[model samples]
Target: KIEEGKLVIWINGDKGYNGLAEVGKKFEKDTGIKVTVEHPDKLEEKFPQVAATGDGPDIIFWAHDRFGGYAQSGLLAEITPDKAFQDKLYPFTWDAVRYNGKLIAYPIAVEALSLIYNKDLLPNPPKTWEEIPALDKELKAKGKSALMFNLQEPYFTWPLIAADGGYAFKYENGKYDIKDVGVDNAGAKAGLTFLVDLIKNKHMNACTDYSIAEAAFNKGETAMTINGPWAWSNIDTSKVNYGVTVLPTFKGQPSKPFVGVLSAGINAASPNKELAKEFLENYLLTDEGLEAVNKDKPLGGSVALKSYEEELAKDCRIAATMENAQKGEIMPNIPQMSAFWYAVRTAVINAASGRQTVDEALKDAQTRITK
Candidate 1:
């Protein structure tokens, strides 16, 4: 049971306040801890500034990559998984929660982008990018667009980049080497050219945000989209029967999506270190606690002990998707990851918008990261 002290937690307000409130209630009831959850818009801005002051929540639930910055700065606690727990988790799931030779975080949710298509429009998902053009021709003949994608968004282009046999950075010798970053690899160039050709040929629209793409698909204007599991609930399955599949490979190699994992971390300077560790051991690490959180947010893959997969499969299709994404790379949690994001976005946007050739854009991006 939790001590009779108050613990304050902060989360972003973008999703739904009611959903978070319900989870908070369940968490507090299970642990006998008083949880005061605040929806603060300035969390991203304020967290770094305040973390150094030795004042923050004992535990914080955030994206894994963001926690990397704190870990690098020695602000977050490093959690080592004992031999027992280590043997219980899936291999890839463990990779998502580890950084800098330390098991510093607990996994909550796992997500990766894939090709989600309306089965009613196309009986089968395309198996290769090469087939996309012909599929577009066939769909247009049937008075429908082949696919819709967000060329402006970096997330949308992630799989395409991977299809080109490119990687953001290579982790070697316990450090990320910028020399081997593959944003401009030959496969990447081929993938970008295919996308630009699709846009030029009117197979896809320029305005390809979530709402626009979903609305178009729901209205039967498009047949497929490349997105994550989060789009599962919003899709109107009645009008557009949909199914999720791995993205088509380029030149026979699979286009692996960039997988993201939600993880938990503790403050290094917390007065309640032992209590916090105990709380994690009982709540976050236990089978019951894993089920509770996974039941609430059933969009992504499970990072719980392998024994919990049976429970996770009951609420979500994480079992099937996890197989496809097992070989997918986890987004790097290094401090330079922010710089990597900006460099990638610039390269992708320039190529998609026709401002520069894919090779030129990638060369520029490589130079920026290297320098």
Candidate 2:
């Protein structure tokens, strides 16, 4: 439907915006179709408000998790790419953008948390929770903290929860059964018990605020933190002396962080569905465009395309994260996940604060989220 005129898109993240800008220039020059890309601050908040008006952009570029919600709301068009196109992407990424059985978007990149450590303080990162106490002793002597990650936030602690076999939802046969909430499992309680033990013993503190954690890491107050590749942008690499590796094992299990895929989706209400899809295939998902997306940046995330895997594996900074992502699971992108966020986050917070026993916290979260 779109040929000779301009097309509009609402996008998120600085990297995604940069990727689009690169493709937009080439696309406009070749097709005489000007592309408008807007990066509003409150994208999720604005999605429905703008989309329902029939004036939303032809395309929306953002994380894949949001697409499932939009798809359920009938806000996203059901996409169908050819077999070759589908085959070129990583299998996990393909699953990320799918809502039920339909393609909801064209995935761009894959992301997951990696253990980010100050190499000067932690030349050898801990491989397990048991190893951290010795590392803490050395760090304390060096006037630094052993750990300082986002304590109040469940996302950073998700690796711990999952490593211990506590899943937010049970995924089966390509669908997430929200009825099977696993927040209060025994493994999950053990994970939280260790977390609170660390905090209570002064190895870390209850002040698990994000800004405080990042500031501590930047100032050398902490030796290691758990964060995603996106955190690279905010770090002063010269001052931090950092390296990334897979998160440590919890109770003899490998940490399984959540994998998030950045992607592009067409608006169901848009008139430019075909052109938008064309733009996605010809420009956004192309190797040249992806190279532009990684240009002069840290490029910590792995591209969705399978052929790029070897090169991504070669990058030391991201190789570990990609490995973790391979072992990781994508969070269920369902409306029910909102319930999990609220209850699980509360459980983590209360457990950390010692307001409730790990037993009490986990039980309450499971009850409230499931019932």
- Pick out the ten consecutive residues of candidate 1 with the lowest summed lDDT: 12-21
Candidate 1 local lDDT, residue 337? 69
The lDDT, on a scale of 0 to 1, for candidate 1 is 0.69
List candidate 1 stretches off by more than 4 Å: 1-5, 8-21, 30-32, 36-58, 80-88, 140-143, 218-220, 236-239, 268-280, 313-320
| Model 1 deviation from the true structure expressed as Cα RMSD, one decimal place | 4.0
Range of the 10 consecutive residues with the lowest summed lDDT in candidate 2 = 292-301
lDDT of 2 by residue, 253-338 (tens): 98888777877888888877877887888776777767766662434468788766557667677888888887778767786665
lDDT of 1 at 324: 48
Q: Estimate each model's TM-score.
A: 0.81, 0.86
Question: lDDT winner among the candidates?
Answer: 2
In model 2, the number of clashes is 0
Question: Any runs in candidate 2 off by more than 4 Å, and if so which?
Answer: 1-16, 32-42, 52-57, 296-301, 354-357
Choose the strongest candidate by TM-score.
2
